[PDB]
Amino acid sequence: KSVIRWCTVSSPEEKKCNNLRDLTQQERISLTCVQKATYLDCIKAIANNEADAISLDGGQVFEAGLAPYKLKPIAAEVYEHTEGSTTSYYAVAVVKKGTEFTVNDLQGKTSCHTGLGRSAGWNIPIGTLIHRGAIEWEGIESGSVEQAVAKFFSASCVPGATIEQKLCRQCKGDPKTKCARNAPYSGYSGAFHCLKDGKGDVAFVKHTTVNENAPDQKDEYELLCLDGSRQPVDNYKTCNWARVAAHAVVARDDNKVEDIWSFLSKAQSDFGVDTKSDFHLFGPPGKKDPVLKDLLFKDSAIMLKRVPSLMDSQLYLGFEYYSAIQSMR
């Protein structure tokens, strides 16, 4: 059919899509918006030929490429801060300059994480240490990864932990709320202030966190590299634990792919970052309300680039990211 069914997951998203539909109705390939409840119902619908495309972040792209769905990324967002590359950010392990331990000596240290279940603060560092054999965890009937992590760090602040009391021990706040998901130490900046205040030896955050929170104090900090070195905060490209890819549009591997990309390439041409139209494919940025943010594509995206036909989800996400999330399941 020369109809692309975009899958949407909220009513403001569903609205943006019907506006792009009105705006492209007289093009030969047309748009039609399907709304489902969650992104997972959208993966099942694309898989079952009920819809054809949706933009997913990296963990959701992992999910969409596994059996039985087997969707692959076909185009990916580009952002200003990562300069032509299909990368959202790099996960790094920030330490104070002058401590001497390397990644070989992490056992028994205290740590700061953004929260339980988050990419840079929990899924990438802990799946990397499990994959490399530093943390032993064989699977959920063992129990939670919280127990395995508690035999590795001596105490931590992990916002959102519920199984192990040591995982909340380094957290700031009164007893009732120090380990809540919205604690004083949650998020990228929270896990950095945990490191700054000496409550942990390592903060698992992203490559921009020190520059955002402490621009004027970068050289008090270093990065812990997976090869044994410690490098400057600005050396994240050669000293990160994993690259977290850009959001990608996933689709069934079948020849409707050139049609989706043909639709997207004209849509971007007319309504991309430099459009004089009122409809913007990408944002613009500055929507304060979460329900109004990043509808269809990220508001910060500046274009979409076609993913080579031979990259599947593993190749798109990269080995470090992939083998770390694979270890968390």
> Binding of ligand NTA at residue 114 (CB under 6 A)?
yes
Q: Which is nearer to Fe ion, 33 or 317 (CB)?
A: 317
Sequence-separated contacts (24+) of 14-17 with Cβ below 8 Å: 16/295, 16/296, 17/296
Q: DSSP code of 219? A: G
Which range of residues in 114-122, 169-177, 224-232, 298-306 is near Fe ion by CB under 5 A? 114-122
User: For the chain, what is the largest distance between any 2 Cα atoms, rounded to a whole number of angstroms?
Assistant: 64
> Binding of ligand NTA at residue 207 (CB under 6 A)?
no
Q: Which is nearer to Fe ion, 43 or 205 (CB)?
A: 205
Detail the residues annotated as belonging to a binding site for hydrogencarbonate: 114, 118, 120-121
Please, what is the minimum distance in Å from the beta carbon of residue 291 to ligand NTA?
16
DSSP string, 12-31: HHHHHHHHHHHHHTTSSSEE
Please tell me the distance from the alpha carbon of residue 278 to that of residue 301, in angstroms, as a whole number: 17
Which of ligand NTA, Fe ion, none is residue 121 near (CB under 5 to 8 Å by kind)? ligand NTA
Q: Which is nearer to ligand NTA, 170 or 268 (CB)?
A: 170
Residue of closest CB approach to Fe ion: 119
Q: Is residue 210 within 8 Å of residue 218, measured between CB atoms?
A: yes
Q: Which is nearer to ligand NTA, 17 or 161 (CB)?
A: 161
Which of Fe ion, ligand NTA, none is residue 200 near (CB under 5 to 8 Å by kind)? none
Can you state the angle between helices 257-271 and 11-24, rounded to 10 degrees? 90
Q: Which is nearer to ligand NTA, 65 or 160 (CB)?
A: 160
Residue 163 CA: distances (Å) to CA of 125, 158, 166, 181, 307: 19, 11, 9, 14, 40
Detail the residues annotated as belonging to a binding site for Fe(3+): 57, 89, 188, 247
Q: Which is nearer to Fe ion, 33 or 244 (CB)?
A: 244
Please tell me the distance from the alpha carbon of residue 35 to that of residue 54, in angstroms, as a whole number: 11
**Residues numbered 151-190 forming contacts with ligand NTA, rule: CB under 6 A:** 188
Which of ligand NTA, Fe ion, none is residue 170 near (CB under 5 to 8 Å by kind)? none
CA atoms within 13 A on the CB side of 116: 20
CB atoms within 10 A of CB 266: 14
Of 8, 119, 123, 327, the one binding Fe ion by CB under 5 A: 119
> Binding of ligand NTA at residue 200 (CB under 6 A)?
no
Sequence-separated contacts (24+) of 9-12 with Cβ below 8 Å: 9/35, 9/36, 9/37, 9/38, 9/39, 9/42, 9/54, 10/35, 10/291, 10/295, 11/35, 12/291, 12/292, 12/295
> Binding of ligand NTA at residue 60 (CB under 6 A)?
no
Which of Fe ion, ligand NTA, none is residue 58 near (CB under 5 to 8 Å by kind)? none
E-state strands within 121-210: 155-157, 202-206
> Binding of ligand NTA at residue 118 (CB under 6 A)?
yes
| Beta-carbon contacts of residue 288 (< 8 Å; ≥ 6 apart) | none
Which of Fe ion, ligand NTA, none is residue 110 near (CB under 5 to 8 Å by kind)? none
Q: Which is nearer to ligand NTA, 209 or 313 (CB)?
A: 209
**What is the total count of residues that contact Fe ion (CB under 5 A)?**
2
Please, what is the minimum distance in Å from the beta carbon of residue 59 to ligand NTA?
7
Residues binding ligand NTA (CB under 6 A): 114, 118-121, 188
Contacts with Fe ion, residue ranges (CB under 5 A) = 119-120
